[PDB]
Amino acid sequence: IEPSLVILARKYKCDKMICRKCYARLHPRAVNCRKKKCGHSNNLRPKKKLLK
Amino acid sequence: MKVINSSRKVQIPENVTVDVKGRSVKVTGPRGTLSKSFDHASVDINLVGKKELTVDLWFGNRKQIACIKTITSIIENMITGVTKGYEYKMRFVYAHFPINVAVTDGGRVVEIRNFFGEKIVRRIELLDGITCYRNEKAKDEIVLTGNSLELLSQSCATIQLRSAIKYKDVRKFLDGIYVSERNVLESN
Amino acid sequence: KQILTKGEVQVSDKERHTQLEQMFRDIATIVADKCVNPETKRPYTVILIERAMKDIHYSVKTNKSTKQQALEVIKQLKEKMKIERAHMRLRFILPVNEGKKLKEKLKPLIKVIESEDYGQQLEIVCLIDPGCFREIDELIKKETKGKGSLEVLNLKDVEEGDEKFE
Amino acid sequence: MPPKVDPSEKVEVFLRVCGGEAGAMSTLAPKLGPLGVSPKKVGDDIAKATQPWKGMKVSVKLTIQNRIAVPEVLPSASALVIKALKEPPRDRKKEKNIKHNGNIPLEEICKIAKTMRFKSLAVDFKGSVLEILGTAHSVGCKVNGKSPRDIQAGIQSGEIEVVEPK
Amino acid sequence: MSGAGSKRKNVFIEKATKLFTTYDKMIVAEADFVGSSQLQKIRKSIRGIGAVLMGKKTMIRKVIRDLADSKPELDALNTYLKQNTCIIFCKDNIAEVKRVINTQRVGAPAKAGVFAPNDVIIPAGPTGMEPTQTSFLQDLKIATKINRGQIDIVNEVHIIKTGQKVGASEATLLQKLNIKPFTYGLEPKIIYDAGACYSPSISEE
RNA sequence: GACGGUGGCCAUGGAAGUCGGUAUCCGCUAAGGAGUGUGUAACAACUCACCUGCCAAAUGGACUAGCCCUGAAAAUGGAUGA
DSSP: OHHHHHHHHHHHHTSSBOOSSSOOOOOTTOSOOOOTTTTSOSOOOBOOOOOO | OOOOOOOEEEEOOTTOEEEEOSSOEEEEOSSOEEEOOOOOSSOOEEESSSSEEEEOOSSOOHHHHHHHHHHHHHHHHHHHHHHSOEEEEEEEEOSSSOOOEEEETTTTEEEEOOSSSOOSOEEEEOOTTOEEEOOOSSSOEEEEEESOHHHHHHHHHHHHHHSSOOSSOTTTOOOEEEEEEOSOBOOO | OHHHHHSOOOOOHHHHHHHHHHHHHHHHHHHSSSOOOSSSOOOOOHHHHHHHHHHHOOOOOSSSOHHHHHHHHHHHHHHHSOOOOEEEEEEEEEOTTTHHHHHHHHHHHSEEEEEEOOSSSOEEEEEEEETTSHHHHHHHHHHHHTSOOEEEEEEEEEEEESSSOO | OOOOOOOOSSOOOOEESOOSSOOSSSOSOTTHHHHTSOOHHHHHHHHHHHOSSSOOSSOOEEOOOTTSSOOOOOOOOHHHHHHHHSSOOOSSSSSSSOOOOOOOOOHHHHHHHHTTSOSOOSSOTTTSHHHHHTSSSOSSOSOSSSOTTTSSSSOOOOSSTTTSOO | OOSOTTTTHHHHHHHHHHTTSSOSEEEEEEOSSOOSTTGGGTTTHHHHHEEEOOOSSOSTTOTTGGGTSOOOSSSSSSOSSSSOEEEEEESSOSSTTTTHHHHTOEEOOOOTTOOOOSOOOOOOHHHHOOSTTHHHHHHSSSOOEEOSSSEEOOOOSOOOOTTSOOOHHHHHHHHHSSOOOOEESSEEEEEEOSSSOSBOSOOOO
């Protein structure tokens, strides 16, 4: 119930590949940036998880 | 490039009636009436009878070819909406402040007072045709409903994006109203 | 070549600036190696130490070694104040689940001894470190764990460090 | 080998990791014993009740307690006893250091050890049992005189001992 | 090209045509939910008497064997173009194969999108619903009613069969509760002969 | 669907496919790595390789060189000459 909510939240914010030459937030299947500043590129990393 | 496209067909149920004039359709169904324009080159968009609407493209580029399918999909969506409407269930969540949402169907608007302890009454008008209704399961959801998917989704988006603190860490909080079930359609 | 070999280095404009800095660096280094505040064995900041060393008065030298000079500095303040020229020993009380990470930070940093690990009981370790390092130790456990960490002295002091006289 | 017995009366299930000499360095899991009502020392004892001398580390052995007392339990893994009896000595002082398995005849041991874990494992008994357990321990060999899965593929041993342990 | 790839298909062809004329009787079973733990107990009883041999959609590579036998593939009951199948072979025990196959079934809750067995009852009523799980019910678009002093969506009858996908919500409900609707494993569709059908009738016993 | 021997053998609070060391084979199979990560004191649970159902004709990849985009920041206002 509560975990579901958390996962939903993550879905739109946290689970997105976050580029590198750019820092554009994309989507978990990404292999490009869709930015003509980034030059599309193929430097996608995951967006990091929470840490205290 | 310039390969000659085939047709893209979309089925039409006997519940609805699809008009078309000057490359610009109009579905009419029990629920209401959606209208949409499509502007392209040599895109013959015709009716076979009252069972199939066809979209064509004589000598399409790859770009041109791509958009045909999109057009078809959009008309399918329209068809769907005007016979059995779209329903987006949105769940809202934050880990301390209870987010106070309340609908006003007179204004056709959702308003959110609390969400991060923000004393503003964050509101935005729903798009033309669509409405929300205050559905309860434990004070956790709001269910938007509509004919047009395009409008409905936009409405959802507006209240999603607004409902989010825009300062410091995005992972730490869960603040927002997010779309849970979007594939569901209102029952008839 | 001859000049390079047998001659001594002379300060140009840039080098003059460096010279000024050098003294500051030396004092920072040499003084902050070994000391504790009077009354009990606790860690304390470098500024205080510097002040203390100024009160008694000290002149650093590039002709002497830094390590050598450290001993000299401590000599002055062993007579004047109560200070710690040697190591101390600590005892931490770690949880079983959350402590592993902590341990891995500490292990390459300083020498671990008396390492008693249990599942049913809490993990216990003991360290060998200088008097100024306690603060460093305790701090890094708390932010990594995200809870409070119990700091206890195994001994108030122990031999070696600058007490063996290197 | 103790006699194979079923659970009866009160049933306290335990998972002992070692059992040749039980806890030397607390090699038994110290959480599992006290959780099921059994002290650490007590647990050490009953580790050796299941397999006194054949007990190795990383075991799948079940130490059951009928009325919180040993019923001379057997059930242990095939892999343990088999490995154990190649080079017989298995305590906890020879199992803290690396060791090579003996190259001695082991065909009659595997058939008994095959169904020591359970009566039916849902696999082919009398047909390819020696093919399975002759190379379960890939390092070394079962017996150097013969070849695993060449002179032991057609050659099988047991008929009542292969389906039920002694 | 053909007869290639990882873990070759050509190899499987040998099993599905040459060993399809070395048995007296057969049974066409259904494997769309049974596991490997459940199924390996039905590869001991069956293996001793015959075998379980099928490459899966290799009945169309059987047409060379149908020259003499004249075997039905699309003509028999179930055309096998909507469900997975695994043909059971037997020669020693032709009578004691139809019931021992059903003895090894194991019951469990339904899964998300599974093809599902014959019988699938959804949880409902006081036993089939909790008071804490009413929120979930409320969330759903379908109506909730008070039957027998408990808030429920009310359905305690068969709404799906073999080859019809269970709903997600229903599956979730099943998983949450301790309700196991039906015991399932390898379920016979029909009894099968060499070049014919012996009995075109289901036998779950 | 992703199993049995099995938590293989090493080592140890605990490392049980999944901190890490070395071998890495067989059963039952259409097929299932002594295992790709998430996770857990370690497990469990989830995920992948692997295999198959549904659908139905093309599909996947590693390169090559054309134009185009990124790389591509400077001071009066502005230069394919407009």
